[PDB]
Design a protein around this ligand. Structure first.
Ligand SMILES: [Zn+2]
Lengths: 386, 610, 45, 330, 171
């Protein structure tokens, strides 16, 4: 009943810091502040709609990302929940460890279970980022006031370059989209204030784009009478795709495999390389800035200086240690040059595990969550035509 | 003989030091520091293919399902012929059936006739018990444990004209006492859950338990793990569980408990090294090399190393390496759940003095998890060793020789159906894009032949004319519907939206589209400082966003140009958010809902605070 | 700026009230006050 | 894969041993009437057995009067199928308190069936999740022998809050084995033996979590395994340096009146001293009765080392060591 | 953390410069059927300056300056609550020697006594003392005196000389 407003006094102030990070550094516009403030203030009326007698307000760290995702689709931005979980688990916008370092004066009177929720306790998993969006579009009506128009062209330009496929699949998918679609445009963002039950329809818009990217890449390769996509090129795709590299997208992707403990291909750190373990620890430098028996600890780090004792990478350093994301592809695309059945489809099945698990880590869902998304797209694409 | 010991224990854990020094003044490293020095010693496989056939628990009453060691039969005793190499494992449907020759690596023999004997129960233990060196021969029999019986066979009369392995048998003694027996060792001496016995090994197959036994049933032992071994043949058995070791001389009334491991470690695995003095024990968190005492054959405990992993399903196998100066004893701890490995070195020298050198680890195969590693004696500073593995949920028993110098079944069941009816109904959608791509190999080619033309210079001024038309309508529709206090498409045209591809001039169409709207009621977003979300780099301009995506699909695209121009405009016509209501729309609306909230939430509704 | 001197390590601590009486670099519970700039006069003989 | 330095707690892990050891208390008290006839539930359990305080396993010597008759009255299926129904029928009411996994956790392991699942496989805290990452990469450059990279893993493992006493000194060789521009290794053990070294008493009645008396303690009747390591080291550093008397005061300063292992290294401070003093550049008043102190000292310090418990020194050989210097002295 | 304390500090704290007393006991029950060894803390009894136990023990005059002491540090004195209370030396009787003093105070000890006596001061090699005095009666008998706890005791010497070793009257 009381100090629930004390949460509210800083749950905007942390969200003040989530967005001012995006504005000052990642070039996000000043209007993005104001788009979210309509999104911010309307849920306070929903709390004001709740009686103060036993209100039990429903705010979590999954909320402050979900209301930060809806401001990106009203502005029609190419930033997504793969471009949020890659900017939070890589310790870039303050999602993780928010209770402990952000207030600095408002901290102490907050109770113990409230201050527990406000820091970045876990990372969201298996549609927990999605079901809150379903609870966000429903509780405050982002529908019927705003535009819930997922710019899917701004989403699958990424998914071409994630795994280095030729750009025909950008339009091969598009006509699979434009065949099986109610209302050709506008994959619908879903709203739910109805009840607490996950409806097993997979009505999330960004969820269903991926199944269109899953069913296309099998159909354009298994049924190829045109012999334009040869098997030996597939043998030069997955062999060139299952290949580690040290770009900052890849290094940032390596952090994302770390954080999720439930699934396999999470104990993937054993296969790390020579260069990979340097910058992973230079990333770990950017965890301690988020994260009377005290001069002993000062005495401890006199014998472990964080820099190297000599020959560090400070000033007279290199030409380039690390290359950019436009240049690793110039080694990937300049590798699989050959371009012009039981064992053909198995070499397609190599990609079937590989690209659908690489997808599975990028968006924080389980394999059963993508099991629903194929069995309700493929069994719904057939029923429309048959 | 080194100094810093106890007589009950002796430790050399991870990466600190020894605990001893003689101070020998002999100019030959004046120490007996219990870490010998050398260079590195890494291990590289020799991979081969040898032979082949609730999710949160596993059961301890299984031990193994394979054994293979050099053996000598009754036709090999009287003859000069010595050294026969077998292999036996459980396979089949229910695992209730049980079934050779190294040439340069170990391979199955060319006559390839495994004696696939059939039983009435799945197999839980397969062992051939090995030979004590005080007999000269190698024992020609095999011990197995089933769920329903206990069979003993006898490997009789291997052939060279047939390479056959025929057997005799013992009478399969069932469960008169109906409790699952755990460990048998010969060195029918068995260990049931809670008690052990001495059973009669027969010499007659053309046709039992001795009256001396004991019970070991710990009342607070919830697990189902046991283990028994003879201790240096002197009629003294070492009886185990996960918690304690019970030593029993069955020859006299002599019982004494030695290990007590309930507090912070528990016994996992215990492989009796073929050395009848030097024996190895593996609890969790520590490797113990507990040997035999030289004078009184009761129990020696010696130099021991901490086991750095912390797990709950630990196993070990140990393989002897005999060199001129010393003996080595590598210690292979494996686990049912993870794939990786960990190995030791113990320089067991002559005068009961030994050391260690360190620990190392190597890599594995991406399909399966290990359940049994099996060593090869190989008939007998470049350490060499050899072992054969058994994986759980992978039935490909391979081979390895370490020396110094995935389409899952959840993917074929979802795709590629074999219905003849809908074999082709999807195929029209397959030919839908076979139609529509070659429809668009020419519709884009309508634009390709035109290079800075004047009909497309006419169309661009026809295009931006039509942008100023429908926008200025809705700007007043936003102005007439201003006081709502309760959207951006730019896809309203339907002419082609596709008959013009000139990227460096299309931005100057859109700068002019921003120049034509300098006043309020309409604002826009940038296109040079917002396009970096695709590439995560500097996007200096719309002119050279194209030039690095032009060089991105050169070698994969046939004709390399038509696919690339049509995505860049497709981005702009889907990042077409040019229809924002200007600043007077949120200023009148943001405070409006905050005026609906009382003074309790006004101070809570405050940005620009610190 | 108002400060002190540490006894052992000569660290010029500056103490506020409701602080621990230790020094910040060495946990040394004995600490001697220093002088400021103040004006005092004297005679001579 | 390795062991992780986290004091981690969850409600299901606090249940599943209270769900475990309570049933052990019954079946042992059920055994107390069967073996005779012919409020924590863990603190009550540990009042029968001794935590070893020196070792992972309290070893017991077998070559003694520790013999025992063998119980040839076996525990068959009859006497076991009748002894277990009365606690398990009684155990059903805490099962309806615990969650739906713990009712299946306890009843599966009640017939054998050791679990496969790791207790640290579901910690999920983004920082503990980064502890288990850099403690399995810490060993993996040690065991692949790469120090100047594993130096930087360990410089960022100490700074995470929650790491224990364990990994601090266990792989402290990274300063020692570097030697390039390093702190020579010994300076860290000096830091270790100051601030974690107590003289407390082992109370044994509290149930211990995340600290363990085999290696990471420093209480009484168990010398700290990083302290005797610091004792054995700097004398080898003394042996490497050819100051000797500093440790020969620093072992003289504590009267460790419990063990035997501190006395021999204290005797070895004089035995190592008396070699170079038995050189003299021979081929004469102070340097004859000077060594005869240190000849006399070891014969006392080993004599009191041998008065203590089981610590088998070469009592024949060590006398023949310093006797060779008497021939050099004469 | 435990650090060394120099006598420059306990002057400033104005408490004693104590040192921990270590004293291990024994519990031998039933002719020693069970033995229990307990090094117990006993408090702080202080430490003479430049003793063994003082931290200026073998300390150089350059290194006596650098711990705030005298460069010709004298030692010898305690520190009790900040006050340098040493212990004055006495004069006692020379030990190991039977003196034969006459004193009229010996006549003050009863009838039949005299002023003749032999006063030996017997120490033990742990530096104790035990003064045994041998008075002379006028009636021919000689008695042996000692002082055990708080009192004075009188025994004939025929009791003692018979009881030391088995000797007859002539020996
Ligand atoms: Zn200080």
């Amino acid at each position: 009943h009381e100090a629930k407003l004390l949460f509210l006094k800083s749950f905007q102030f942390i969200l003040k810091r989530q967005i001012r990070w995006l504005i000052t550094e990642m070039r996000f516009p000043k209007e993005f502040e104001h788009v979210a403030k309509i999104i911010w203030l309307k849920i306070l009326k929903t709390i004001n709609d709740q009686p103060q007698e036993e209100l039990k307000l429903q705010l979590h760290m999954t909320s402050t990302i979900s209301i930060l995702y809806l401001a990106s689709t009203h502005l029609s931005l190419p930033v997504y929940t793969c471009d949020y979980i890659k900017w939070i688990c890589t310790a870039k916008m303050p999602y993780f460890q928010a209770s402990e370092i952000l207030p600095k004066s408002w901290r102490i009177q907050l109770p113990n279970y409230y201050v527990s929720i406000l820091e970045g306790s876990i990372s969201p998993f298996n549609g927990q980022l999605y079901n809150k969006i379903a609870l966000t579009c429903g509780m405050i009506h982002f529908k019927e006031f705003f535009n819930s128009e997922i710019s899917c062209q701004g989403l699958l330009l990424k998914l071409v370059m994630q795994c280095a496929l030729p750009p025909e699949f950008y339009f091969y998918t598009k006509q699979v989209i434009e065949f099986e679609e109610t209302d050709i445009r506008n994959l619908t963002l879903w709203e739910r204030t109805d009840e607490r039950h996950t409806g097993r329809v997979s009505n999330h818009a960004e969820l269903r784009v991926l199944s269109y990217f899953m069913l296309t890449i099998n159909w354009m390769l298994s049924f190829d009478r045109d012999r334009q996509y040869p098997l030996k090129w597939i043998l030069s795709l997955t062999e060139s795709l299952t290949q580690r590299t040290t770009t900052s997208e890849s290094i940032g992707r390596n952090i994302v495999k770390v954080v999720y403990p439930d699934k396999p291909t999470s104990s993937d750190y054993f296969q790390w390389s020579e260069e990979e373990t340097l910058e992973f620890l230079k990333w770990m430098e950017k965890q301690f800035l988020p994260t009377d028996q005290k001069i002993a600890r000062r005495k401890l780090y006199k014998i472990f200086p964080l820099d190297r004792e000599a020959n560090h990478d400070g000033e007279f350093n290199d030409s380039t240690h690390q290359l950019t994301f436009i240049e690793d592809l110039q080694e990937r695309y300049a590798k699989q040059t050959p371009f012009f059945p039981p064992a053909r489809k198995e070499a397609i099945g190599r990609l079937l595990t590989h690209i659908a698990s690489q997808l599975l880590v990028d968006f924080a869902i389980s394999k059963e969550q993508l099991k629903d998304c194929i069995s309700r797209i493929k069994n719904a694409c057939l029923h429309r035509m048959n | 003989l080194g100094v810093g010991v106890q007589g009950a224990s002796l430790y050399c854990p991870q990466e600190n030091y020894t605990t001893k020094k003689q101070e020998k003044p002999q100019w030959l490293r004046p120490v007996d520091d219990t870490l010998a020095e050398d260079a590195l010693d890494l291990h590289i496989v020799v991979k081969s293919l040898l032979c082949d056939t609730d999710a949160f628990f596993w059961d301890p009453t299984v031990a193994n399902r394979l054994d293979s060691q050099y053996i000598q039969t009754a036709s090999d005793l009287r003859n000069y012929r010595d050294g026969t190499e077998i292999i036996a494992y459980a396979s089949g449907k229910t695992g209730s059936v049980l079934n050779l020759t190294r040439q340069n690596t170990l391979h199955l023999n060319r006559h390839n006739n495994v004696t696939s004997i059939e039983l009435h129960s799945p197999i839980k233990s397969i062992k051939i018990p090995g030979a004590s060196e005080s007999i000269g021969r190698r024992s020609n029999l095999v011990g197995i444990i089933t769920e329903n019986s206990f069979q003993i066979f006898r490997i009789e009369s291997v052939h060279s004209r047939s390479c056959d392995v025929m057997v005799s048998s013992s009478e399969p003694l069932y469960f008169v006492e109906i409790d699952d027996l755990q460990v048998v060792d010969f060195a029918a001496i068995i260990d049931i859950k809670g008690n052990w016995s001495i059973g009669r090994i027969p010499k007659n197959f053309n046709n039992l338990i001795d009256n001396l036994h004991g019970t070991i049933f710990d009342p607070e032992e919830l697990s189902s793990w046991k283990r028994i071994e003879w201790f240096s043949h002197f009629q003294k058995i070492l009886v185990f569980d996960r918690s304690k070791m019970i030593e029993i001389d069955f020859m006299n009334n002599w019982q004494t408990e030695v290990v007590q491991a309930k507090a912070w470690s528990n016994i996992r695995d215990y492989k009796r090294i073929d050395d009848k003095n030097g024996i190895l024990l593996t609890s969790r968190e520590i490797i113990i090399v507990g040997a035999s005492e030289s004078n009184d054959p009761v129990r020696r405990i010696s130099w021991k190393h901490d086991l750095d992993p912390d797990d709950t399903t630990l196993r070990i196998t140990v393989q002897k390496v005999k060199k001129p100066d010393h003996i080595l004893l590598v210690a292979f701890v494996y686990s049912m759940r993870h794939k990786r490995i960990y190995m030791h070195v113990f320089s067991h020298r002559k005068a009961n003095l030994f050391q260690s050198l360190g620990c190392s680890t190597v890599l594995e195969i991406p399909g399966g998890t290990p359940t049994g590693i099996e060593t090869i004696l190989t008939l007998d500073f470049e350490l060499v060793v050899d072992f054969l593995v058994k994986l759980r949920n992978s039935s490909e028993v391979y081979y390895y020789a370490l020396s110094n110098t995935v389409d899952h079944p959840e993917w074929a069941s979802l795709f590629n159906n074999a219905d003849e009816r809908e074999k082709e109904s999807i195929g029209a959608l397959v030919s839908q894009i076979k139609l529509k791509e070659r429809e668009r190999i020419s519709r884009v080619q309508n634009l390709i032949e035109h290079e800075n033309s004047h009909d497309e210079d006419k169309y661009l001024q026809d295009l931006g004319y039509r942008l100023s038309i429908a926008t200025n309508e809705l700007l007043e529709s936003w102005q007439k519907t201003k006081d709502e206090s309760i959207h951006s498409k730019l896809k309203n045209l339907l002419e082609n939206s596709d008959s013009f591809a000139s990227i460096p001039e299309f931005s100057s169409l859109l700068d002019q589209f921003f120049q034509y709207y300098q006043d309020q009621d309409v604002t826009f977003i940038g296109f040079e400082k917002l396009l970096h979300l695709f590439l995560h780099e500097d996007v200096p301009g719309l002119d050279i966003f194209y030039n690095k995506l032009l060089q991105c699909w050169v070698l994969v695209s046939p004709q390399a140009e038509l696919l690339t121009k049509e995505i860049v405009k497709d981005i702009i016509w889907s990042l077409a958010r040019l229809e924002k209501p200007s600043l007077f729309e949120p200023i009148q609306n943001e405070i409006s809902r905050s005026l609906s909230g009382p003074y309790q939430d006004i101070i809570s509704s405050w940005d620009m605070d610190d | 700026t108002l400060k002190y001197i540490c006894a052992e390590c000569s660290s010029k601590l500056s103490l506020s009230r409701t602080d621990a009486v230790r020094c910040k670099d060495c946990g040394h519970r004995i600490l001697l006050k220093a002088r400021t700039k103040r004006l005092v006069q004297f005679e001579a003989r | 894969m390795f062991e992780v330095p986290i004091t981690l707690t969850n409600r299901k892990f606090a249940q599943r041993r209270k769900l475990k050891y309570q049933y052990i208390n019954y079946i042992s008290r059920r055994f107390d009437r069967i073996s005779k006839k012919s409020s924590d539930e863990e603190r009550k359990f540990w009042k029968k057995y001794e935590k070893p305080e020196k070792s992972f396993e309290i070893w017991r010597t077998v070559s003694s009067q520790n013999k025992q008759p063998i119980n040839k009255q076996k525990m068959t299926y009859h006497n076991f199928k009748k002894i277990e129904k009365i606690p398990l029928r009684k155990m059903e009411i805490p099962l309806l308190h615990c969650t739906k996994e713990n009712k299946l956790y306890f009843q599966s392991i009640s017939r054998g069936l050791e679990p496969l699942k790791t207790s640290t496989s579901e910690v999920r805290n983004y920082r503990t999740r980064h502890i288990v990452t850099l403690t399995d990469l810490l060993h993996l450059n040690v065991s692949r022998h790469n120090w100047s990279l594993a130096y930087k893993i360990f410089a960022t493992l100490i700074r995470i809050p929650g790491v224990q006493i364990k990994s601090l000194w266990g792989i402290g060789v990274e300063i020692l084995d570097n030697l390039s521009n390093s702190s020579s290794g010994l300076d860290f053990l000096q830091w270790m033996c100051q601030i974690y070294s107590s003289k407390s008493r082992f109370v044994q009645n509290i149930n211990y979590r995340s600290i363990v008396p085999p290696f990471q303690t420093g209480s009484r009747t168990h010398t700290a395994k990083f302290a005797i390591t610091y004792l054995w080291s700097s004398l080898i550093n003394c042996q490497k340096s050819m100051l000797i008397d500093k440790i020969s005061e620093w072992v003289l300063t504590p009267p460790f009146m419990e063990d035997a292992e501190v006395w021999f290294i204290y005797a070895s401070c004089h035995l190592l001293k008396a070699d170079t003093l038995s050189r003299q550049f021979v081929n004469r008043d102070i340097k004859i009765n000077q060594v005869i102190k240190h000849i006399h000292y070891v014969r006392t310090f080993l004599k009191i080392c041998l008065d203590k418990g089981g610590f088998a020194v070469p009592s024949r050989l060590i006398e023949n060591q310093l006797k060779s210097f008497e021939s050099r002295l004469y | 953390v435990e650090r060394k304390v120099y006598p420059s500090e306990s002057r400033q704290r104005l408490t004693s410069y104590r040192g921990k007393l270590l004293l291990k006991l024994k519990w031998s029950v039933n002719n020693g059927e069970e033995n229990l060894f307990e090094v117990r803390d006993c408090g702080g009894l202080p430490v003479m300056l430049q003793s063994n136990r003082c931290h200026l023990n073998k300390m150089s005059p350059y290194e006596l300056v650098q711990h705030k002491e005298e460069s010709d540090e004298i030692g010898g004195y305690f520190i009790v609550n900040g006050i340098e209370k040493l212990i004055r030396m006495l004069i006692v009787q020379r030990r190991n020697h039977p003196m034969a003093i006459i004193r009229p105070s010996f006549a003050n000890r009863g009838a039949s006594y005299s002023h003749y006596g032999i006063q030996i001061r017997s120490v033990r090699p742990d530096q104790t003392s035990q003064t045994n005095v041998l008075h002379y009666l006028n009636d021919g008998q000689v008695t042996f005196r000692f002082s055990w706890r708080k009192n004075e005791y009188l025994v004939p010497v025929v009791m003692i000389l018979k009881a030391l070793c088995h000797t007859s009257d002539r020996e």
